[PDB]
Amino acid sequence: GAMNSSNYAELFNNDIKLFVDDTNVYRVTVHKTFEGNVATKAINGCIFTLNPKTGHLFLKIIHTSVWAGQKRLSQLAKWKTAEEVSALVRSLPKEEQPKQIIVTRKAMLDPLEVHMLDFPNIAIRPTELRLPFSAAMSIDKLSDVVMKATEPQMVLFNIYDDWLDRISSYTAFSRLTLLLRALKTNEESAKMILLSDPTITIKSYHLWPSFTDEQWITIESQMRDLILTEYGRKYNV
Amino acid sequence: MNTVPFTSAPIEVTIGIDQYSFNVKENQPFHGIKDIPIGHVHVIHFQHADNSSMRYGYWFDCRMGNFYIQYDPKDGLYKMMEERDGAKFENIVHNFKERQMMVSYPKIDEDDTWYNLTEFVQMDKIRKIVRKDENQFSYVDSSMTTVQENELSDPAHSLNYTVINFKSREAIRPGHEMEDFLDKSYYLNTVMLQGIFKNSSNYFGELQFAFLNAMFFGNYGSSLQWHAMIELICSSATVPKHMLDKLDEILYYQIKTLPEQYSDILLNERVWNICLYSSFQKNSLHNTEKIMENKYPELL
Ligand SMILES: CNC[C@H]1CCCC[C@H]1CN1CNCN1
């Protein structure tokens, strides 16, 4: 059933599972036409498919060519998402395929269920959590690889960098969601926090700066302040 | 005209015959139902005055034999039985008619209701849904589960309706996932019509039989089946025009006949609002939409 606050630690047991977020699959800019009408122009998107225990991000880039000549693109986007997730699972060997796929939006359940009928033993689940994975395109390297793609492409990143060498999955997931919740509430501030100190670099194959443990504690504290603040600045409290 | 005599009426019971019903008191002198129209299936059904639980009854076609009702005090119900001795039967019936101990199937001449509810319903297909091949008539009650319900527990006592499941490999062609799920024409026309039912008459007959079991027995799995078969048509973009026109007539008479006070349990809001207002056929069921809007505007 639905993943929520109560069964949170199931994410970090040894049953392979993936989160799928489709928020950034179909992305548009809205603009005026010469006649003063409005039109959309699609830009590249991505499926965000994440193993929360290991940090594997299977970033399937959705090139704007997949929308050419198609109608009802917001609906197609959910079925395209499901098609690509199903293709991903099929590509994997059996022991490496997930036991559960958790979708972040309920509208992905039926498209993914239908695409996975060949896998009756993979549970497709919703969640009540309001996970901030839409902010994945606020991570500079992810946004960069999506926008530069000239064809469909799958790119692999560890969204935890090397954190698991020192902290547990549970803690790594909590750090990720805090970083993303911050980036989603105030991207400018959030990014300023992460990069304020020039001496702290990001490794070639990483996404985040190489903070020491003590530096992560400071960073994590600053991200909480931001989120609390923007909650005031938004609600006047 | 045919007759279904009763040996006796030892327990107080409401007796139904098709869409009609009458009350019979304990040990009232009642010896059956006469003037039953030939050419249609019929259902004779029962609700005990003491245990309104378990409505039950029997589907039959008087052309297939001489049938009578006799209470069984061991099993506690009115049982349909076949009399093979034709002269014994004629003699019993004539005596009971001469003593005027039978009620008359009370059909108004203008009234095509029963025909319109059973147009495509055949005894031979009923007998494949309700499996009991040593009898020519078929028992149904409120509690019987469907084969599909059993998959989600006694198989001998099941309603073997055709399994319809919109999220099934049978319903969904590999590579047409979105296409087949949003437009079920493949599933209706190729899988179900061409493949399983063979023609739309058999499809409509199972649809009508499922409605009737839902209405007369409050049989939940039958109601599920009726709505699934409606939904499969309404959610198909490509439906033969004659099927749509006939479906509109079928549903019109089902909605017309439904008790005003049972619509809360027998009508699925989601299916009817989807079918009448969002589906591909939202514009194709004019009679059904008008009667639904005038009679159950709350549901919608
Ligand atoms: C096919 N399992 C995935 C592995 C790919 C090669 C390196 C180890 C795993 C890499 N991770 C990073 N994000 C994506 N997966």
UniProtKB/Swiss-Prot annotation, chain A:
Disulfide bonds: none annotated. Changing D22A: Reduced growth at 30 degrees Celsius. Strongly reduced growth at 16 degrees Celsius. Strongly reduced growth at 35 degrees Celsius. Changing D21A: Alters protein folding. Severely impaired growth. Strongly reduced growth at 35 degrees Celsius. Changing D22N: Reduced growth at 30 degrees Celsius. Strongly reduced growth at 16 degrees Celsius. Residues 7-237 are annotated as: RNase H homology domain. It is found in: Nucleus. Present with 468 molecules/cell in log phase SD medium. Component of the U4/U6-U5 tri-snRNP complex composed of the U4, U6 and U5 snRNAs and at least PRP3, PRP4, PRP6, PRP8, PRP18, PRP31, PRP38, SNU13, SNU23, SNU66, SNU114, SPP381, SMB1, SMD1, SMD2, SMD3, SMX2, SMX3, LSM2, LSM3, LSM4, LSM5, LSM6, LSM7, LSM8, BRR2 and DIB1. The MPN (JAB/Mov34) domain has structural similarity with deubiquitinating enzymes, but lacks the residues that would bind the catalytic metal ion. This is Pre-mRNA-splicing factor 8. The chain holds residues 1836 to 2069 of 2413 of the full protein.
UniProtKB/Swiss-Prot annotation, chain B:
It is found in: Cytoplasm; Nucleus. Heterodimer. Interacts with PRP8 (via RNase H homology domain and MPN domain), competing with BRR2 for the same binding site. Component of a U5 snRNP complex that contains at least the U5 snRNA, PRP8, SNU114, AAR2, SMB1, SMD1, SMD2, SMD3, SME1, SMX2 and SMX3, but is not a component of the U4/U6-U5 tri-snRNP complex. Phosphorylated on serine and tyrosine residues. The gene is AAR2. Component of the U5 snRNP complex that is required for spliceosome assembly and for pre-mRNA splicing. Involved in splicing pre-mRNA of the A1 cistron and other genes that are important for cell growth. Pfam families: AAR2 (PF05282), AAR2_1st (PF20981). Belongs to the AAR2 family. InterPro entries: AAR2, AAR2_C, AAR2_C_sf, Aar2_N, AAR2_N_sf. GO terms for biological process: spliceosomal snRNP assembly; spliceosomal tri-snRNP complex assembly. Residues 244-265 are annotated as: Leucine-zipper. Keywords: Cytoplasm, mRNA processing, mRNA splicing, Nucleus, Phosphoprotein. This is A1 cistron-splicing factor AAR2. The lineage of its organism: Eukaryota, Fungi, Dikarya, Ascomycota, Saccharomycotina. The modification Phosphothreonine is found at T257. Present with 7330 molecules/cell in log phase SD medium. Signal peptide: none annotated. The modification Phosphoserine is found at S236. One of its GO terms (cellular component) is U5 snRNP.
